[PDB]
């Protein structure tokens, strides 16, 4: 579980979006596993606008934050699940680290702010759905 709250926007993993998120949909992308819904309260998370490839992520299955080196946002194949068929997920960044079902939503951050959220895992690898290109989240 986990979301990014910036301005009047809530950012979640699309496969974990609620009825309220869908009834207040702003934008969603199946290929990215992202969904943005509108909120009443004003969020204060800062979104990073950079090309940082090092940062720290929250791993709820360990109740710990871990420093990681991570790859550039790209199209990476993701195995079938009860949420999606086997496909290439776009804007995905991988790191060597622990992630298991339940860790989706954990925020990845660099010194500039929020980079993205945990979206894939397994095999000693963790996948993060990048949000740094969504410039509209700020305005």
What single-letter DSSP state applies at residue 30? T
Q: Is 44 a catalytic residue?
A: no
Closest residue to Zn ion, judged by C-beta, is 52
The full DSSP string for 60-125 is: TTTTEEEEEE-PPSEEEEE---SS--SEEEEEEEEEES---TT-TTPEEEETTEEEEEEEEEETTE
Classify residue 26 by burial, with Cβ atoms within 10 Å: 0-12, 13-18, 19+: middle
Of 37 and 99, the one with the shorter C-beta distance to ligand A1B19 is 99
Q: Is 21 a catalytic residue?
A: no
Q: Interface with Zn ion includes 50 (CB under 5 A)? A: yes
Q: Looking at 21, 91, 103, 104, which residue is catalytic? A: 104
Q: Is 15 a catalytic residue?
A: yes
Contact set with ligand A1B19 (CB under 6 A): 15, 33, 78, 81, 83-84, 89, 99-101, 103-104, 119-122
Closest residue to ligand A1B19, judged by C-beta, is 121
| Cα gap 128→100, rounded to integer Å | 13
Nearest approach in angstroms of CB 28 to ligand A1B19 is: 13
Which residues of the shown chain bind Zn ion in the complex (CB under 5 A)? 48, 50, 52, 110, 112
């Amino acid at each position: 579980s986990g979301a990014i709250y910036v301005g009047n926007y809530r950012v979640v993993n699309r496969h974990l979006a609620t009825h309220n998120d869908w009834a207040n949909l702003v934008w969603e992308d199946s290929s990215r596993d992202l969904l943005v819904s509108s909120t009443t309260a004003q969020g204060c998370d800062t979104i990073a606008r950079c090309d940082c490839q090092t940062g720290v992520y929250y791993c709820s299955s360990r109740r710990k934050h871990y420093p990681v080196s991570f790859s550039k946002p790209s199209l990476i194949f993701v195995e079938a699940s009860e949420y999606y068929p086997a496909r290439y997920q776009s804007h995905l960044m991988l790191a060597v680290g622990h992630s298991e079902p339940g860790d989706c939503g954990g925020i990845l951050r660099c010194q500039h702010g929020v980079v993205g959220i945990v979206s894939t895992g397994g095999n000693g690898l963790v996948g993060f759905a990048d949000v740094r290109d969504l410039l509209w989240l700020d305005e």
